[PDB]
Amino acid sequence: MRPSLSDYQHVASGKVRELYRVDDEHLLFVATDRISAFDFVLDTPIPDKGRILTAMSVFFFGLLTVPNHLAGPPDDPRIPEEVLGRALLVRRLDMLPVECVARGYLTGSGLLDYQRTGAVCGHVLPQGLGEASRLDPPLFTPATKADIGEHDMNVDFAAVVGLVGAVRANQLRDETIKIYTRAAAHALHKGIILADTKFEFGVDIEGNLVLADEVFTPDSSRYWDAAHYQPGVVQDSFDKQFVRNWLTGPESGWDRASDTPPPPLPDEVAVATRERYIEAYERISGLSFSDWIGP
Ligand SMILES: CCOC(=O)[C@@H](F)[C@H](O)c1ccc(Br)cn1
């Protein structure tokens, strides 16, 4: 028999994820069905999104050889029925206060910083780059969390040294670039570009660096269709473009520039979005989502 979620202490809440205490040395990482667009958490959930993103994380934890925070199987008895398939049993770690970001392509705040200064997070770049330009080798572009509602602040390597130490900062940079390079090549071989990714790490009792976050989900990473990749224009979001198109189109009745919260989504847009998440998972993993555990 599985415990109730109310048997555990709710310890933290995020935009589309939740965290619970299991005992002194273990936590429960939970993915919800909520989705974000244009910096709003939308009213309408995407069915099975939490389960699909958890399947994705478990696949990539398996593929990568680096230590990670998993402390049990996806069907561990300590996981409540209500979150089965969208929750993981993990070990408690001393977390490092650095958002460890790798970028293989120039977009978002990376592109903006380049267009303003000619550099990104202390990396002076060649002249002549633009939207969705390839960056090779990929860049370590660390950031720090700001206040509620605000975007993370981009920082340089020296800033990271002052947060975690010189030797540890070099380790974060090296492991972030190594892991991203491997995952990106794997996805591209199957027709999906991982344009960038954001990692969070912790340290265990022996001093070892441990990957401790969801990993390579379409929330932590920009997924693009490789078949339509064209440097110089904005790329469609593999998972979120149907949501974006409806919200900004003729039928929503919503003006993005009003900064008012958006309306609920059509049921059919939510179902089409679920299909897109399933397509991304099955193409990258080579597995079938119909075999992933659930309630
Ligand atoms: C950059 C270090 O991050 C942390 O310290 C952790 F708390 C972790 O990122 C976290 C936060 C909120 C939720 Br919900 C789940 N996990």
UniProtKB/Swiss-Prot annotation:
PROSITE patterns: SAICAR_SYNTHETASE_1, SAICAR_SYNTHETASE_2. GO terms for biological process: 'de novo' IMP biosynthetic process. It catalyses: 5-amino-1-(5-phospho-D-ribosyl)imidazole-4-carboxylate + L-aspartate + ATP = (2S)-2-[5-amino-1-(5-phospho-beta-D-ribosyl)imidazole-4-carboxamido]succinate + ADP + phosphate + 2 H(+). The gene is purC. Pathway: Purine metabolism; IMP biosynthesis via de novo pathway; 5-amino-1-(5-phospho-D-ribosyl)imidazole-4-carboxamide from 5-amino-1-(5-phospho-D-ribosyl)imidazole-4-carboxylate: step 1/2. The lineage of its organism: Bacteria, Bacillati, Actinomycetota, Actinomycetes, Mycobacteriales. Keywords: ATP-binding, Ligase, Nucleotide-binding, Purine biosynthesis. This is Phosphoribosylaminoimidazole-succinocarboxamide synthase. Belongs to the SAICAR synthetase family.
